[PDB]
């Protein structure tokens, strides 16, 4: 009764589909699956002992996409009007593609990542990649802090700049620990000196 099947094609078409789906959702390259076929593919052609090297596969692919994001952000411009918009837009792009790969790799979560706490999440791996390669460890960090000190300080003298830009930037800061490790300090110290000048002036 019931002679066994062959799993051979199942394993080897898989990796290529992984990295093209990565290649699809990153850069917003279009998909011929409507993503549900891909989700089912994740669900079927991932099993016991498949998932960890699969994680390696996907995280190196997305990792190199993240490090491809680097190069327009290692720069010498000093807009905080525009450079921080570029950062924010890259932030949004990153956001949508990491949420959407989770819309594909939620099987991975509800099998090994949500169902075993051994790894950074897709959230967490994505944030660490984005931070490490775009936000942290760069001139951007100092430049974005300086620029947002400009924006708020300009917005501390009258004018409104962009409530959305300040909100989104502060979101990036706090989630990447960049508003709770050491960059609260530039905010507070500029506040100290500026508001001291304000108070003893109009006093």
């Amino acid at each position: 009764r019931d002679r066994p099947r062959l799993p051979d094609n199942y394993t080897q078409d898989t990796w290529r589909k992984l990295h093209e789906a990565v290649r699809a959702v990153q850069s917003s390259t279009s998909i011929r699956y409507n993503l549900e076929e891909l989700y089912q593919a994740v669900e079927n052609l991932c099993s016991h002992k498949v998932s960890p090297m699969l994680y390696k596969q996907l995280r190196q692919a997305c990792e190199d996409h993240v490090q491809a994001q680097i190069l327009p952000f290692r720069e010498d411009s000093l807009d905080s009007v525009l450079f921080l918009k570029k950062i924010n837009t890259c932030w949004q792009d990153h956001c949508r593609q990491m949420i959407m790969i989770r819309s594909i790799f939620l099987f991975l979560d509800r099998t090994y990542v949500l169902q075993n706490s051994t790894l950074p999440s897709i959230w967490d791996m994505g944030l660490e990649l984005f931070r490490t390669h775009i936000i942290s460890d760069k001139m951007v960090q100092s430049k974005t802090i300086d620029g947002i000190l400009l924006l708020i300080e300009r917005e501390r003298s009258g004018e409104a700049v962009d409530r959305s830009l300040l909100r989104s930037l502060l979101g990036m800061l706090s989630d990447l620990q960049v508003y709770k490790d050491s960059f609260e300090l530039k905010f507070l110290e500029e506040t100290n000196c500026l508001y001291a000048a304000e108070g003893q002036r109009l006093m």
């Binding site: 009764r1 019931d2 002679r3 099947r5 799993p7 094609n9 199942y10 699956y33 409507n34 993503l35 549900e36 076929e37 989700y39 089912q40 669900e43 079927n44 052609l45 099993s47 016991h48 990491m98 949420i99 959407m100 989770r102 819309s103 939620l106 099987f107 979560d109 509800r110 099998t111 949500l114 169902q115």
Partner: protein, 1096 residues
């Protein structure tokens, strides 16, 4: 005032008394079993016992004896309650209806009297002329029966002997004649008196007082042919009929004392005798023509430790045990080649004396799971108790990585689905499942080359199979496909859905409607959605025409379980959910009332809705979190209704009870997929797949508490869970005789590794104490550390102290020598379990028994004999005292919440202590000055302290609101009727605040929780109404039963609601409910009481 709700999570299981007779009918042979407050009536069938009625007494059944007055057709039952409620009960069955009518009742408690040492005796004259009760020293209460009372008016006869051990009515005597053993300074003697109901006083007995063995503790009245009595002592069995004095000293009964007996015959030629070791003896009377010739004792074998044993018939003996599981054994005529004639037929679970217990979230669920030190000397064990559905694993076949399961009736005639389909990666493999046999044989019309998202039986006597490529509608009887549809662009179906009549399958971001026609597949509707399909359901429910009207959809990037009108694919509703996770399954079903929708996200969240058949608009959004893995929902139809199953890390049955949605747990590790199956060889069964194999079984769905048993074969004493190490530390105790020798292989002696305490501090039968490390998966004894000679391990805590990170097993012991009444010596030993070994990390010689240790804010809080002192864990890893407290008689119980320490005393009952860290010493905050002898204590709130006195009462103390502020106020009083050994925070489940479980000596597990003032008032009102409506068995008043009771105090209950009585509000018919709910409507209260039952 405190508002507490007490309820029974597990009814008492310890059999304190059992009798046999013709109670339910003159021809029935009944086994009446008294578990502390429950009377269980069985019928002695040719095999086993058939339960017929289980009633709840408002009392601890102290006496329970069947008697048949003259002219009566069938036995009446006399019950005496611990609070001395006497009643005579008769069984009246009127067709389906069953009643226990009270033929008489009363309260025979003397206002004053020294309750007799040996305990409440109740005997009945063999001719039913009177019920003799020995309740108090020096008195003998007589309840006449010939004067047919309804109130049981009873009178005392002054008994000139004040220490009566046991007493029986003799047989074959013209007058009611009692024979009793009593102890006077000159020894123990057996005396007889004749009872005169006319003179209401004793007379000279038939045969004068006789000086008997020193330890005579049992009298056996022997029926008429012999008459006389048989007095059992430790070393002898002697027979008295007045002139005859047979006496034997069988050497085999010297090892243990005989504690129960039962007359096998009607003529008393054979008796069973149970000893405290669990041996079972047969005492034979050899008649000579009739007088009695000689006595013989023969050892039949071993049983559970019997409290009571009754011979039913055909060699079947019920061994009712308080310490272990009760037994139904058989007595073989021939020995078993091991010298034993006893052969256990059945075992009845007994959570024995629950001496300690812990609530562990084992299996890393959201469900608590009790682990209790149950039982005693030979019957000790760990019981693991949990609430979840249980199924048998009948048919297993190990096929890796299942991804599909569907029931197919390959035999077209039968409506049973005798064929099972499975998709794995890219093919379909079928199973004949013929009978109970399982093998893979192929049915025509289905392809072995493509994955299968669905298949099943459809209308027009057709089968259907939806594959990754295209759909296939097979005609069952004739041959293979005559209808096929495929996507015009030949795109693989990414999401599917199907029912018995129509089909709905998604192709990426667009959807296709097909409907079945006999030997045809017709496409009708189509739509182009914004984003890709995530899940569907089109199930016809309450259909009544032949086609479902509605559909549901989940979409990507716009996460929303939206609704569609079937013929048009149009948006009826669009409800967002949030999160970046695509829903993976969506279902709609009916639960007794209407269409609900069940949509879940990949992380176990699950939303239930009220769906309308006209608008199909989603409202009543409410969420429940079930597991962490993505989920799938497939229904099975039970006897009653649709019962939806959820498949994930924590498989959960989904259903509604009393119009209230319940989320039950299933006790299986994992289930990938499920499908109903009702084969000829398998009725209403389940078919549950995991990553490895296909498990098959059935569910009772009674939501009963499941109890595992780990036999330790030695008395467990304490238990704590060390999570970091994945083990339980259990204090065990085994009895060795001789240097010493174990009487049996205990769990301590059978550990993987072992060790003995080599300590430099201190330099018949004895108790050896061990520390058992038990695996929290396999419950195997990973290690057993024996403690010093003559060292009693009393307390045991698992914790990490100070600042070091290691988690330690800390045992507080005492040195027990017979030369003293209170240990002077003891020590606190710190163990670490690592690398399968138990190293001794520290020691501390203390000057008393360490009755209790609680870990208290990084520090060890031990209670040596009368002192409560706090130890600190120094960097050197030794315990160093920080503060002491001495104003205690015996600090027996310690609890903690923050800086506060609750001390339960041997007899000063509670003390609220505070560790003021700013100073580094204790402060007596409040104290309860009533003399309550505690059995356990707990902290409910910052200022509510649950207590249990050894008189079976619960009281809640409260720090009031000057030196009267140092008085705890007893704001709660309640008579439980059970002896609480342990409290513990936790709950066995996924309106009320907090949840405290407690385990008792009888095996009850109860639950105390805090109510609000409004609900408490309402429930008290309904309690009074139910008391006015519900009628108790012995016509006992509930308020009297729950009244706080002590030998020197008696007050009505207050601040406590009998959750048993409230939950009884469901088991009464609607007119009785209306009688309850005269002055809101009833359905409100049904909802209330359902929600109350939700806590256990």
């Amino acid at each position: 005032m405190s508002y507490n709700y007490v309820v029974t999570a597990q009814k008492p299981t310890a059999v304190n008394g059992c009798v046999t007779g013709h109670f339910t009918s003159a021809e029935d042979l009944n086994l009446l079993i008294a578990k502390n407050t429950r009377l269980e009536i069985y019928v002695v069938t040719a095999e086993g016992l058939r339960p017929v009625k289980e009633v709840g007494m408002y009392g601890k059944i102290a006496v329970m004896e069947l008697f048949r007055p003259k002219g009566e057709s069938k036995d009446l039952l006399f019950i005496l309650t611990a609070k001395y409620n006497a009643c005579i009960l008769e069984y009246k069955q009127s067709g389906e209806s069953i009643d226990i009518i009270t033929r008489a009742h009363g309260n025979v408690q003397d206002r004053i009297g020294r309750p007799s040492e040996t305990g409440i005796i109740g005997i009945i004259d063999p001719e039913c002329r009177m019920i003799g009760l020995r309740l108090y020293d020096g008195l003998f209460k007589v309840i006449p029966l010939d004067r047919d009372n309804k109130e049981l008016k009873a009178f005392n006869i002054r008994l000139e002997e004040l220490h009566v051990i046991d007493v029986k009515f003799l047989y074959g005597c013209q007058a009611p004649t009692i024979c009793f053993v009593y102890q006077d300074p000159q020894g123990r003697h057996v005396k007889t008196y004749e009872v005169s109901l006319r003179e209401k006083e004793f007379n000279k007995g038939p045969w004068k007082q006789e000086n008997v063995e020193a330890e005579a503790s049992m009298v056996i009245a022997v029926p008429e042919p012999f008459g006389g009595a048989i007095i059992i002592g430790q070393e002898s069995i002697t027979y008295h009929n007045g002139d005859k004095y047979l006496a034997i000293a069988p050497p085999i009964i010297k090892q243990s004392t005989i504690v129960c007996h039962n007359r096998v015959d009607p003529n008393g030629s054979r008796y069973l005798l149970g000893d405290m070791e669990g041996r079972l003896f047969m005492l034979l009377l050899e008649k000579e023509e009739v007088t009695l010739k000689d006595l013989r004792v023969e050892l039949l074998g071993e049983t559970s430790i019997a409290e009571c044993l009754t011979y039913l018939d055909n060699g079947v003996v019920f061994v009712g045990s308080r310490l272990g599981d009760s037994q139904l054994v058989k007595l073989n005529v021939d020995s078993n080649e091991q010298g034993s004639y006893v052969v256990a037929m059945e075992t009845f679970t007994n959570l024995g004396p629950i001496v300690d217990m812990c609530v562990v979230d084992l299996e890393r669920q959201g469900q608590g799971q009790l682990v209790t030190c149950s039982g005693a000397f030979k019957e000790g064990s760990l019981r693991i108790i949990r609430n979840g559905i249980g199924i048998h694993e009948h048919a297993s076949i190990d096929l890796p990585g299942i991804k599909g399961l569907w029931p197919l009736r390959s035999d077209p005639n039968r409506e049973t689905d005798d064929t099972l389909v499975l998709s794995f990666v890219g093919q379909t493999r079928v199973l004949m499942l013929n009978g109970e046999e399982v093998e893979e044989t192929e049915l025509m019309g289905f392809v072995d080359d493509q994955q299968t998202f669905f298949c099943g039986n459809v209308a027009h006597q057709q089968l259907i199979q939806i594959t990754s490529a295209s759909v296939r509608l097979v005609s069952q009887e004739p041959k293979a496909l005559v209808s096929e549809w495929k996507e015009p662009q030949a795109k693989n179906i990414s999401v599917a859905s199907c029912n018995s009549s129509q089909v709905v399958v998604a192709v990426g971001r667009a959807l296709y409607y097909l409907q079945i026609h006999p030997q045809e597949l017709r496409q009708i509707s189509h739509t182009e959605m914004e984003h890709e399909v995530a899940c569907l359901d089109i199930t016809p429910l309450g259909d009544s025409n032949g086609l479902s009207p509605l559909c549901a959809i989940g979409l990507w990037t716009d996460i929303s379980a939206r609704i569609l009108k079937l013929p048009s694919f149009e948006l009826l509703h669009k409800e967002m959910l949030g999160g970046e996770i695509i829903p993976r399954s969506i279902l709609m079903t009916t639960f007794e009332s209407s269409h609900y929708l069940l949509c879940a996200l990949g992380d176990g969240a699950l939303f239930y809705f009220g769906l309308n058949i006209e608008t199909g608009l989603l409202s009543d959004r409410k969420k429940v979190t079930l597991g962490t893995q993505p989920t799938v929902l497939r229904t099975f139809r039970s006897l009653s209704t649709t019962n939806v199953f959820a498949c994930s890390d924590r498989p959960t049955v989904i259903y509604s009870s009393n119009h209230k949605l319940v989320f039950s747990n299933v006790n299986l590790k994992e289930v990938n997929y499920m499908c109903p199956l009702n084969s000829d060889g398998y009725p209403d069964s389940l078919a549950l797949a995991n990553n490895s194999t296909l498990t098959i079984g059935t569910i009772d769905e009674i939501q009963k508490l499941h109890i595992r048993t780990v036999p330790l074969y030695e008395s467990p004493r304490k238990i704590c869970y060390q999570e970091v190490s994945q083990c339980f530390g259990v204090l065990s105790s085994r009895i060795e005789v001789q240097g010493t020798t174990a009487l049996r292989p205990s769990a301590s002696t059978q550990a993987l590794s072992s060790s003995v305490s080599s300590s430099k501090l201190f330099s018949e039968e004895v108790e050896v104490h061990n520390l058992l490390i038990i695996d929290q998966h396999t419950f195997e004894v990973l290690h057993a550390h024996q403690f010093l000679q003559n060292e009693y391990a009393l307390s045991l805590v698992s914790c990490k102290l100070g600042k070091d990170p290691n988690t330690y097993f800390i045992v507080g012991t005492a040195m027990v020598y017979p030369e003293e009444a209170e240990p002077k010596q003891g020590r606190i030993v710190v163990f670490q379990y690592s690398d399968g070994k138990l190293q001794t990390v520290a020691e501390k010689e203390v000057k008393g028994a360490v009755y209790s240790m609680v870990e208290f804010n990084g520090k060890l809080l031990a209670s040596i004999n009368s002192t409560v002192r706090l130890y600190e864990w120094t960097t050197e890893k030794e315990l160093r005292t920080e503060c002491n407290h001495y104003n205690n008689i015996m600090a027996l119980y310690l609890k903690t919440k923050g800086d506060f320490i609750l001390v339960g005393d041997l007899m000063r009952s509670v003390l609220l202590l505070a560790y003021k860290p700013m100073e580094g010493n204790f402060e007596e905050i409040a104290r309860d000055f009533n003399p309550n002898w505690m059995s356990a204590v707990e902290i409910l709130d910052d200022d509510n302290f649950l207590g249990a006195e050894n008189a079976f009462n619960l009281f809640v103390c409260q720090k009031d609101s000057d030196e009267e502020r140092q008085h705890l106020q007893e704001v709660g009083l309640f008579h439980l009727g059970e002896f609480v050994n342990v409290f513990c925070h936790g709950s066995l489940v996924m309106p009320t605040q907090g949840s405290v479980l407690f385990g008792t000596v009888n095996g009850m597990i109860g639950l105390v929780t805090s109510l609000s003032e409004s609900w408490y008032n309402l429930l008290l009102d309904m309690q009074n109404r139910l008391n006015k409506v519900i009628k108790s068995v012995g016509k006992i008043e509930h308020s009297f039963w729950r009244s706080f009771h002590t030998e020197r105090k008696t007050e009505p209950a207050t601040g406590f609601i009998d959750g048993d009585l409230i939950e009884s509000f469901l088991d009464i018919s609607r007119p009785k409910m209306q009688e309850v709910v005269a002055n809101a409507t009833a359905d409100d209260l049904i909802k209330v009481v359902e929600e109350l039952t939700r806590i256990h």
